[PDB]
Design a protein around this ligand. Structure first.
Ligand code: UZY
Ligand code: ZN
Length: 414
């Protein structure tokens, strides 16, 4: 069991795993937060904190808005919504952990401690302060890897924010703040030709939000190991005439995260270039660890932190105590994080209906309520065993299971 406490939003603060917290630096008032697992926290609040550019929840000027956007400044403003948000997110982590692939991914994420690259002197290993949160009581700072937070103004923009050396792309990693909601999901079409056409389909089938969360956690895995691909390296889509009409550009990072046939649109040569780039980053980390002869702070010993990063990066260690990067082990970890952890593989483990490509067109956004077990379960999602929803993905079929879905906006035609 991944989350061994059944938190309620109104549970009293204890300063340990239910607490008021602040983000170092950041303006922000303390927010009630919940530690659901080692290194992983949930803040059931709309994100007005991580980006100074984004404090308001009202829509920007309409000329500013993308077509696939959805605003509702009232969402997640009440205690009952935050209770259901917290319970919904924990339920989705348990659904992910109930699969072997999700257990692997979540183990990688917990082991993926952001590197202690904060020192200005080679002989000292030091934390980077923005990979911590401040737990209020006086305050005490504590390292963490992942925070799930409510969305900012655009509810369906599930961006990842972090503070930063380009930490998500230099091998170091940084604490990831994932904007996410378990209370909404997207509709897609069961025919591929319809799903990849911007003019057709109303969104008959609903994405299982466990797949959406797993998709975001895959990105967070890349980012915590500092191997995310530069967002400006993109596929200028020439396989979908409507992508080419609209000139839609999709980053290699997305195509990698979806996996399946999409990842083959990254050419072998540019993939080798990324692989060599990140291999060299891991070598620099080994070199940094070898120069460090003392540790800064009171939380852990030098030899404990060297071993934490040996385990994170799969470093080899010679009989003199010196670390190095073995290409066979680097390739195994890199492939694990980039080719084994993919959306397409999660669909296989969950046995759900899902989009077949990232290169489609979104159809609709639905309100959902996955907290009741009569609606959704850790092991079956919407497709509840021993009911009329168990077969043929009937629980994801928004026409059969219509009481579980409220369509809020249509995107077809926009
Ligand atoms: S977690 C990295 C940014 C995620 C942006 C939303 C997304 O994953 N869309 O496919
Ligand atoms: Zn993505």
């Amino acid at each position: 069991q991944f989350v061994n406490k059944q938190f309620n939003y109104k549970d009293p603060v204890n300063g340990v795993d239910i607490a008021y917290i602040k983000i170092p630096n950041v303006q922000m008032q303390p927010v009630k937060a919940f530690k659901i697992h080692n290194k992983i926290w949930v803040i059931p609040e709309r994100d007005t904190f991580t980006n100074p550019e984004e404090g308001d929840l009202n829509p920007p000027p309409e000329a500013k808005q993308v077509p696939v956007s959805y605003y509702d400044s009232t969402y997640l403003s009440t205690d009952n919504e935050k209770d259901n948000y917290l319970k919904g997110v924990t339920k989705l982590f348990e659904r992910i952990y109930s699969t072997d692939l999700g257990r692997m991914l979540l183990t990688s994420i917990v082991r993926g401690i952001p590197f202690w690259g904060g020192s200005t002197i080679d002989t000292e290993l030091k934390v980077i302060d923005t990979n911590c949160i401040n737990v209020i009581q006086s305050y005490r700072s504590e390292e963490l890897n992942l925070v799930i937070i409510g969305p900012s103004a655009d509810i369906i923009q599930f961006e990842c924010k972090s503070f930063g050396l380009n930490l998500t792309r230099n091998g170091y990693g940084s604490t990831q703040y994932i904007r996410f909601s378990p209370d909404f999901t997207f509709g897609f079409e069961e025919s591929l030709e319809v799903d990849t056409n911007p003019l057709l389909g109303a969104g008959k089938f609903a994405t299982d939000p466990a797949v959406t969360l797993a998709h975001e956690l895959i990105h967070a895995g890349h980012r915590l190991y500092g191997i995310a691909i530069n967002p400006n390296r993109v596929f200028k889509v020439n396989t979908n005439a409507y992508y080419e009409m609209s000139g839609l550009e999709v980053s290699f990072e997305e195509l990698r995260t979806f996996g399946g046939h999409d990842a083959k649109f990254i050419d072998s040569l540019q993939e080798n270039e990324f692989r060599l780039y990140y291999y060299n980053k891991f070598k620099d980390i080994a070199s940094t660890l070898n120069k460090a002869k003392s540790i800064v702070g009171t939380t852990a010993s030098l030899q404990y932190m060297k071993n934490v990063f040996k385990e994170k990066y799969l470093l080899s260690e010679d009989t003199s105590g010196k670390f190095s990067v073995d290409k066979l082990k680097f390739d195994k970890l890199y492939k694990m994080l980039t080719e084994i952890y993919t959306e397409d593989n999660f669909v296989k483990f969950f046995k759900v209906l899902n989009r077949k490509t990232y290169l489609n067109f979104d159809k609709a956004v639905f309100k959902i309520n996955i907290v009741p077990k009569v609606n959704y379960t850790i092991y079956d999602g919407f497709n509840l065993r021993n009911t009329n929803l168990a077969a043929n993905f009937n629980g994801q079929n928004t026409e059969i299971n219509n009481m579980n879905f409220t369509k809020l906006k249509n995107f077809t035609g926009l």
